[PDB]
Design an enzyme around this catalytic site. Structure first.
Site, PDB file in Angstrom:
ATOM      1  N   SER A  46      41.862  41.008  46.008  1.00  0.00           N
ATOM      2  CA  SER A  46      43.309  41.101  45.760  1.00  0.00           C
ATOM      3  C   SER A  46      43.877  39.913  44.966  1.00  0.00           C
ATOM      4  CB  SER A  46      44.075  41.240  47.073  1.00  0.00           C
ATOM      5  OG  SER A  46      43.825  42.501  47.689  1.00  0.00           O
ATOM      6  N   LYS A  49      45.289  40.897  41.629  1.00  0.00           N
ATOM      7  CA  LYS A  49      46.634  41.438  41.416  1.00  0.00           C
ATOM      8  C   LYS A  49      47.499  40.529  40.503  1.00  0.00           C
ATOM      9  CE  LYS A  49      46.786  44.446  45.534  1.00  0.00           C
ATOM     10  NZ  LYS A  49      45.341  44.244  45.925  1.00  0.00           N
ATOM     11  N   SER A  94      49.871  43.366  49.623  1.00  0.00           N
ATOM     12  CA  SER A  94      48.589  43.587  48.966  1.00  0.00           C
ATOM     13  C   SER A  94      48.239  45.094  48.898  1.00  0.00           C
ATOM     14  CB  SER A  94      47.514  42.780  49.708  1.00  0.00           C
ATOM     15  OG  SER A  94      46.414  42.504  48.874  1.00  0.00           O
ATOM     16  N   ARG A 226      42.485  31.108  55.913  1.00  0.00           N
ATOM     17  CA  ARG A 226      42.679  30.964  54.474  1.00  0.00           C
ATOM     18  C   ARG A 226      43.823  29.979  54.187  1.00  0.00           C
ATOM     19  NH1 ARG A 226      43.181  37.244  52.746  1.00  0.00           N
ATOM     20  NH2 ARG A 226      44.669  37.090  54.481  1.00  0.00           N
TER      21      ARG A 226
END
Ligand SMILES: [Cl-]
EC number: 3.5.2.6
Lengths: 241, 241
Positions: A46, A49, A94, A226
């Protein structure tokens, strides 16, 4: 570049392994915990994107950040996806299917040309046009993410200025009296090794710090690491309070 | 319009008085605690930095949000003003002298014409060109701030789309996973009655709420109340957690 093997503690502390890459724009110097993994390429998932949005806006596939992309009525596993979206909420949640349709309308020829112009990773879109960033041949490393992101920050990519400003708006993640974060998460699950991503930058009053993080992610249970590990390093280096 | 007197509780707790005005964009309905004060006109003070920024950008007085405006070397009472700034930090720290120089370069004829085009308050710039929004003849009400801000949000003001996106970037104040606030503070002290302003909007996944607040400010001790009282009302109406 500068290597600090001591930073490895942030990943081992959580029984995983990974890399953080930082870049000081004023001083033009880079820092990482592991130079080899910093240069190791993975599926972007993702995080793709960001370039996908840029290309779609420049070609008129997306008119602006308010245009509504209707739910196609197929019930998918992520509840957040089973509703209408515009560019801002499609980024935030997402929403894969929205971006799969973007890629189909862009087409193979124009997608390939743009990525070559962007110098994006290995610039290779082999696989299905509507899933190559998920299980095809495109690859990019943390250091390569930094290079791409620096061009976007300075409006230096070969698409319109308007396109670049709209995508930076859509990347907005956090802001307060001390800093602004513009960034995008990713989670690559289709092909081994499964990993999580966070890439972007931190705007301060008189400087900008770019960052790219990835880590092994055998299950979805650890996705919060993350942001957590990246912020721990930033706090450690006194970039944020 | 609809009047909600229960909001007065948030002002009286601090023994001061003022007005909050809200506008629900999805339903096109307005709400306020005091219909009368909502239409009372005041000096805009530093909220005038929104239109001043738009005009400077559209005429090229400001090239972009990175251009540096040098300190003129005069030590003023607010330390944050006594240094170099760009458009982002000059908004953030309300740097009057930077915007005084903007106004001198725009000039009387072009300033006046722009304000007529914007339908900005009484459209009267009589006074010193470099201070009329602080001690000259321009006046605007809370309800008129709402109307002006709605035009900006929709890119409908009579300047380029680019100028409008850059000022909205510069207005960025707070953001998290629940909302985004773009706004500007003001503090009118040169001419009575002394007041504080906070004007802007809150972006949600599926709606936008515009707001305009002012309150009496006899001392600087209560400046923090511009944001806290506004936030209290938003919390009551369940707009923010
Ligand atoms: Cl923005």
């Amino acid at each position: 570049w500068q290597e600090n093997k001591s930073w490895n503690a942030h990943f081992s502390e959580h029984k995983t392994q990974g890399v953080v890459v930082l870049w000081n724009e004023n001083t033009q110097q880079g820092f990482t915990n592991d130079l080899k993994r910093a240069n190791q390429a993975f599926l972007p998932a993702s995080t793709f994107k960001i370039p996908n949005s840029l290309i779609a806006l420049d070609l008129g596939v997306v008119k602006d950040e308010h245009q509504v992309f209707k739910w196609d009525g197929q019930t998918r596993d992520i509840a957040a996806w089973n509703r209408d979206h515009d560019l801002i909420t499609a980024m935030k949640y997402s929403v894969v299917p929205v971006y799969q349709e973007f890629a189909r309308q862009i087409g193979e020829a124009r997608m390939s040309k743009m990525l070559h112009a962007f110098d994006y990773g290995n610039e290779d879109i082999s696989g299905n046009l509507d899933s190559f960033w998920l299980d095809g041949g495109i690859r990019i490393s943390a250091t390569q993410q930094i290079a791409f992101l620096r061009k976007l920050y300075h409006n230096k990519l070969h698409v319109s200025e308007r396109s670049q400003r709209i995508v930076k708006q859509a990347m907005l993640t956090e802001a307060n009296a001390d800093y602004i974060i513009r960034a995008k998460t990713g989670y690559s699950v289709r092909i081994e090794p499964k990993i999580g991503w966070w890439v972007g930058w931190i705007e301060l009053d008189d400087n900008v710090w770019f960052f790219a993080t990835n880590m092994d992610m055998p299950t979805a249970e650890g996705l919060g690491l993350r942001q957590t590990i990246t912020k721990a390093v930033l706090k450690q280096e006194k970039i944020i309070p």
